[PDB]
Symmetry: D2
Subunit: 240 residues, 4 copies
């Protein structure tokens, strides 16, 4: 089976230096161009997805819609799940990254941003940046929607969706495309590749360049994953 | 329940004067702006669909994607069906409308364009504009795909989808949005309003302006349908 | 692909000589044994369905449940639809077949029972045997539910389900089993085999014996259909 | 919302004293009678489920089919998931309970049978009682299918199904019926009622008597759960 992962490009809050998490902000103008590039790469390299999965956040959905327009595959069915959403940033949602760094110090800042298992403080329900009660989550058990998450917790809520729903299409022979976010894709890669809890902190997935996995019958990589544009495939950080 | 209908704006072949039918062309630049306007009207009139239905033709899917981005409702579930597709134009697909008019004369040309039950001539299998074997229809019974259609035949294949699938959402209390095509929407409007076979030749649905039906528990209009921009009505522009 | 059709065995009103149609009666004791036999034949002939389709009438659902228990395939997915329902018998539902014969004469009685296109008289709304407002049809467009049907009308409402939903499973390589009724299966067999309007009045499908179609990629029979117990064929018993 | 839980009655292996786990054995004759009683109780007490969820194990599916036949609600849609299956008994699958008790001692026997978090030893893939490769699990990620489970592990794989799928129907206003097994229902009850890790070991759910939960908008009990037949509702053990 073949799995294609696309991380959305810059959002309007990334350009203003604000932590986003589950706040539903749109792509910036550069983000829209990165999505177009992703779709041009699917077309140039002839990777034609049969089914699309997205999160419930607009920035990843806009990305997929632009990419699939460029790759001429807009007609494919689409499924969306909260379990592919970005990590919830707790009380850091809506805060300035430079102001947060000065407030907490580099140590705490880097623990919140990149520890495997230390989540940022929980957000308050009265906060304007809380998603409690948002309409797009009204049919999910209200007790499972997070008030903060670490990457470990993202993985725990992402896996069951991979196991029962995405895997069914891969095992049926479909090429699946996932349009999602930095932490939810980092979580999935950790799982497929078997990256340790300590090393995953160092993994970065460039924005806007599709990552392909060729998997065998047990859904394990049959060869190393590869980006559709290796040169551009970025290891030099954007912000991290 | 509430139903919102949106006809896509101008396609790239409408700009070039060619009959499109099931050929999968994209929106022109004007078409894209008409889609954004439909989205602005949804947002301005506070009409917020809970589920989207599109045909399998890119021009309607692009229209919904742009509209829902402007209405800020990109997260809603999306279902697609061939039964919402434009009428299949048979052997006229890919043909110049002026040349066709010169070749068949006014009388035959307006019959093919607007009779209720006389279809255009069947497309040939060789034709570069036939959709036989197209990947997006591979899971439908091959025997039901049309080689040509009249409005009457469009209605016969649309209604079973309306009866079991769209009706289920409407009867469950969802606001449903349909992004589709001139003849498939004319077909549906003929059914909801009880317009005679003689009279729907005169019905035209403007491009890019959402048409709202408020329906009762029997799925019959409880009040007249209305456009979200009544002033801008009339489809007599861009071809009468 | 492979399709397996099973007509339910005798209902409790068939035993009492009453026209059933959409009235939801249960299997008789004999009917239950006929369902177990169909299951034994599936298991003995190694025909193992991957998905089950039933109507919304208990007698066909009970039949599938007993059969699949005997074939050891109870875990497969199950889909139900009103479009697989028996023909609606109009004002004849709940009526004694002998008394009806005495009241309309042979000629009118055999037309109603077996013409292709003359339906029985419409049921009245008062009737204790009408299904109007029945909870199991509450999510279908109320306007499409029948007040009476002929075989021709059964075929018109069955085919769209066959074309989009059952065909999708067959074209995906699933073996599909349908547990349904004499007229809905006669309707489907007329379509697959190309039996004329004059000739399907003579087609009878025995109760409880699975009928197998081996179909090609166009969903046309690639070889003659066959029963799993050819010897026991003929539906001339329990009414000719 | 209203949730109804039914534990299946005796299987053919329970009567022979063998641990079952995921081995797919059928109900005994007493088990079939207990299922009929469950359905008679739904009818007598007027609890009419709108949707059914079952595991992928025949004993729970047969239970539901018999119960729904007695309550006259066979037409309701049906969904099945491996996540509602019984606890996998690891290497104890297929072993005699008395022979296992003498082999291990009461201490180890009771840890394996009722500890919250100590699973029995893993089963071998070559064992005849292993479910690795079984056809009904072929579309699930092969890496998540267990080789042994404790109740803690059952709960971890059951919860995501409850959170996204079952909860959606409860939140949509449907009365849901779950037909499942002792440990998967004990897991769900632990979660809804907030029973501690140490106390859940003592919880027993009688076979064949529906347990009803009346839940509020956050899916928490609005009043204590109750059995449809309190007297019979058994606390005196069957085997435990």
């Amino acid at each position: 089976p073949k799995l294609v992962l696309v991380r959305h490009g810059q959002s309007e809050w990334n350009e203003k230096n604000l932590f986003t998490g589950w706040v539903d902000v749109k792509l910036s103008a550069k983000g829209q161009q990165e999505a177009a590039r992703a779709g041009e790469l699917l077309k140039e390299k002839k990777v034609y997805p049969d089914v699309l999965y997205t999160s419930k956040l607009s920035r990843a959905i806009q990305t997929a819609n632009i990419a699939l327009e460029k790759a001429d595959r807009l007609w494919i069915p689409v499924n969306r799940s909260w379990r592919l959403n970005e990590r919830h940033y707790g009380d850091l949602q809506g805060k300035d990254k430079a102001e947060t760094l000065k407030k907490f110090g580099e140590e705490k800042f880097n623990t919140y941003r990149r520890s495997f298992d230390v989540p940022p403080p929980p957000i308050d329900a009265s906060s304007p940046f809380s998603q409690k009660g948002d309409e797009r989550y009204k049919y999910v058990d209200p007790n499972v929607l997070p008030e903060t998450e670490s990457l470990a917790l993202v993985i725990d809520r992402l896996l069951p969706y991979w196991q029962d729903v995405i895997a069914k299409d891969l095992l049926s022979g479909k090429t699946v495309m996932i349009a999602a976010h930095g932490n939810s894709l980092r979580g999935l890669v950790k799982h497929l590749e078997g990256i340790s809890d300590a090393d995953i902190a160092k993994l970065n997935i460039p924005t806007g360049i599709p990552l392909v996995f060729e998997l065998d019958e047990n859904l394990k990589p049959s060869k190393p994953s590869y980006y559709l544009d290796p040169e551009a495939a970025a290891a030099g950080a954007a912000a991290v």
